[PDB]
């Protein structure tokens, strides 16, 4: 029934604090834990007054988890559930996965085994990491790694924030992301992806603001995510379990990575304008300028979409708005796939931050999907890697951290067959 | 008249030199020219003390007399100098001396 969550890496933690915020916000549970089953699949009714979170936090520098235990919400989690390794983060996979990251893992696991026990027939762990980091790429790599073995019998949906197409940060980023992909690939169930840059566009083009603090992108994913777990694990006219996803969403064992998209992104101050039609939002979903991912459907044929709706929506409206789409053709779906549209309908409309910059409509569409499109995104990220590896660039930083020419070269070959995979499962009939 | 020359600094392959005029009325000798060249080519990367000698375009021989300076010439500034030799300068047009080229009716 439930779904634990492990927010790994400063980022996965910032995004975590965010997604975690939106939560209580739409569940009437002040930062003090108290509100005045349903949603029990994400919150445990500990003591007789509060609602201790149902997740954990893993960063190797204290800085970021520290800030959580300062700002209201400080009261929300258990002093315990926020894991730290005073040591060093290191923007390098190796160190975070092998060398350092190792020391903590046990302890980390312990919670996802201590928190996994306390519950009642769970469904999986929503993992939150930032592909191109040290604690986010490496560590998790083995966290998800140690999970796929300790609970192979569950769902492993990892929600990632993969490398901005041109606006990356770390100098090595690819090293860290070609490595978190190959090690997690054979361990995840469904990997959701939200592109940091391609989200900015949305903040520039669909909300207008050249002042987007990280704290915003987080509010956004913090939204799209709320549409995944939160509301879905919440009763409705067309419920969709976590398993449901991976089933209706992955055509093949590769921990396939769909893309997250939201429909109503419109800025407060617009807040009064006449609302958008069920048809418009539906249509907005097929626009490559509103998908939290720089993977513009440049050719990538969709192969399965899970249209999660929430708010006031008439099933016919959908079983029509989608019909219209199924026949737009310029939206070309894979061949071997007749119908690939999982319509998920929830009741409770979205819930926008009291005064951030999100419109606040009475219905939204968080559609996610597997698109032969990422054939690109992976490509462009793989190429990166080579260029540097081709010169070993910052290689001495990993080797000296318990890695080898193996893990790199052999994780490169890995993704290679991910460029062929995402190519074969499509483009051909 | 004077003599138009394009003065390059040895070991630069970037700066297109500076054009100077040279005569008996402006500079009594090469030391006086070199004195003004130290001010106009004043640097601390290609030229140690700014400009102490002037070498041919190839750096095979240094000039000591103004009589060796021809119109529309190319010279190099040195102070050791050790020569790379840096040519460079190229490329520029000979239009500093005069525009050889003209417009055409295209």
């Amino acid at each position: 029934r439930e779904c634990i969550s492990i927010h790994v890496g400063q980022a996965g933690v910032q995004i975590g604090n965010a997604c975690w915020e939106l939560y209580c916000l739409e569940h009437g549970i002040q930062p003090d834990g108290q509100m005045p089953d349903s949603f029990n699949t994400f919150f445990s009714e500990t003591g007789a007054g509060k609602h201790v979170p149902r997740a954990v936090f893993v960063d190797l520098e204290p800085t970021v988890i520290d800030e959580v235990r300062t700002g209201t919400y400080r009261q929300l989690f258990h002093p315990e559930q926020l894991i730290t390794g005073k040591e060093d983060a290191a923007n390098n996979y190796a160190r975070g996965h092998y060398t350092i990251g190792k020391e903590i893992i046990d302890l980390v696991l312990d919670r996802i085994r201590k928190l996994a026990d306390q519950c009642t027939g769970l469904q999986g762990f929503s993992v939150f990491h930032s592909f191109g980091g040290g604690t986010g790429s490496g560590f998790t790599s083995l966290l998800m790694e140690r999970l796929s073995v300790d609970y192979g019998k569950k769902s492993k949906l990892e929600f990632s924030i993969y490398p901005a197409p041109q606006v990356s940060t770390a100098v090595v980023e690819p090293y860290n992301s070609i490595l978190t992909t190959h090690t997690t690939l054979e361990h995840s169930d469904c990997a959701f992806m939200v592109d940091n840059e391609a989200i900015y566009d949305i903040c520039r083009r669909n909300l207008d603001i050249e002042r987007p603090t990280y704290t915003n992108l987080n509010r956004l994913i913090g939204q799209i995510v709320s549409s995944i777990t939160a509301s879905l694990r919440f009763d409705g006219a067309l419920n969709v379990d976590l398993t449901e996803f991976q089933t209706n969403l992955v055509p093949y064992p590769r921990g396939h990575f769909p893309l997250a998209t939201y429909a109503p992104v419109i800025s407060a101050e617009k807040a009064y304008h006449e609302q958008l039609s069920v048809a418009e939002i539906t249509n907005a979903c097929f626009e490559p300028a509103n998908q939290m991912v720089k993977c513009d459907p440049r050719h990538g044929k969709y192969m399965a979409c899970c249209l999660l709706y929430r708010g006031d929506v008439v099933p016919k409206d959908v079983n029509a708005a989608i019909a219209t789409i199924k026949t737009k053709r310029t939206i070309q779906f894979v061949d071997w796939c007749p119908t690939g549209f999982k319509v998920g309908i929830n009741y409770e409309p979205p819930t926008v931050v009291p005064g951030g910059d999100l419109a606040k409509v009475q219905r939204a569409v968080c559609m996610l999907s597997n698109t032969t499109a990422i054939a690109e995104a992976w490509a462009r990220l793989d190429h990166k890697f080579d260029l540097m590896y081709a010169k070993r660039a910052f290689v001495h930083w990993y080797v000296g951290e318990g890695m080898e020419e193996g893990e790199f070269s052999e994780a490169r070959e890995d993704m290679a067959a991910l460029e062929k995979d995402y190519e074969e499962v499509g483009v051909d009939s | 008249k004077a003599k138009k020359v394009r003065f390059y600094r040895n070991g630069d392959r970037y700066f297109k030199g500076i054009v100077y005029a040279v005569s008996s009325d402006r500079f009594r000798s090469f030391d006086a020219l070199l004195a003004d060249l130290t001010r106009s080519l004043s640097d601390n990367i290609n030229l140690p003390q700014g400009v102490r000698y002037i070498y041919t375009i190839d750096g095979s021989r240094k000039i000591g007399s103004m009589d060796e300076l021809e119109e529309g010439e190319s010279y190099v500034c040195s102070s050791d100098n050790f020569f790379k030799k840096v040519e460079y300068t190229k490329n520029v047009n000979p239009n500093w001396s005069v525009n050889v080229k003209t417009s055409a009716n295209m």
Binding site: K86, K384, M388 | -
Partner: protein, 426 residues
Amino acid sequence: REIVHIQAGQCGNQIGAKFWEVISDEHGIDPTGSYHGDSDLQLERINVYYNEAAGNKYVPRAILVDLEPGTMDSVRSGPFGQIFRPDNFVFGQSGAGNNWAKGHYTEGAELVDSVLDVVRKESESCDCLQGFQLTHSLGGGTGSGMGTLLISKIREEYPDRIMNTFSVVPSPKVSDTVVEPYNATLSVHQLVENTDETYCIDNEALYDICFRTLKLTTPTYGDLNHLVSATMSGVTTCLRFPGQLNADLRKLAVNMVPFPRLHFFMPGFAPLTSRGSQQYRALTVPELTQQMFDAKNMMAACDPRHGRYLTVAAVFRGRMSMKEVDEQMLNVQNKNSSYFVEWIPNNVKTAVCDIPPRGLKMSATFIGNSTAIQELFKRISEQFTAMFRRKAFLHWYTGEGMDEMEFTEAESNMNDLVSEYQQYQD
């Protein structure tokens, strides 16, 4: 994490006073006082440079190595001079002769053990050690010789912890000594083979950058030092602060050194505007990259424009958009594709702290690993040969128990070091 500064020689020492003059204020630590910190964040990470004893006395964890009393007795008899625990002062009342050989083989070699002793007392302080900061000048005894030894020993004791080296490579135009290339070539040698991050500063690259980028007409040493110390604060200490994207010595190291030599960088500060007037505030950000990436403004002597880069690390520290930061860096990488080396798709290593330099709104330390620094070791190496050839003031070395093959060694080594660096400029 932690680090333990090292004030080798007078210069390295004089600068200590300025590096600590600053850093302290950038951490609210009065002479012997405690943390007056205007904020509460300038304390959660101090450890990196201090130690807890009393409760108001966080003492700088550095070492003061020098064979000339008067010096440390000027640093210890002035302003912040009374914050270092006396145990820190590893003096050598001997004759601090200006000979690399006199402070590396004969005179310094003795005072060494009484140093390592402390460098261990400080290392085994507590928590986890990161590396050691080293200040000195490669143009003297207690600096190049004895300090270059201090490291050769440090790097045998903890080949794990890092070693940043702040060297005052012999300025071109006019040298503040005569054998300079002797004391230098000999110390660079030791550097290229022990420390793994060196930040070379030039007393005259500073003057310039301090007399034209700061209309400052009377740039006393204190100043130069002050400017330098400004950069070394942005580097270390800084990153030991929070940030949207923070790094730390290693990141800096593991993103900046493509090849094991150790390679030397060239630090550059961001807001470098004259006091009153200039206070243009044109610091939105394009203004900082405008700054940092220009020729002048590179504490080094050489000019970047004279050779590609291998790596760059804009360690910014002041609230800004990971977009207007990550973005700018790009155009910069494309407007100058010419010099920025290609076999590294993204040379630049964007780093981003949060809290800025106490009184400023936005700054950004620059740590460049350009191939341009080839044209400096060349310089040095030249000066050597031109004088080695005649064994100029060599008797002051040999007569101190040295070798005619020792000088040969260094030059070559450091001379080859020039070679290699070109292997990438091409």
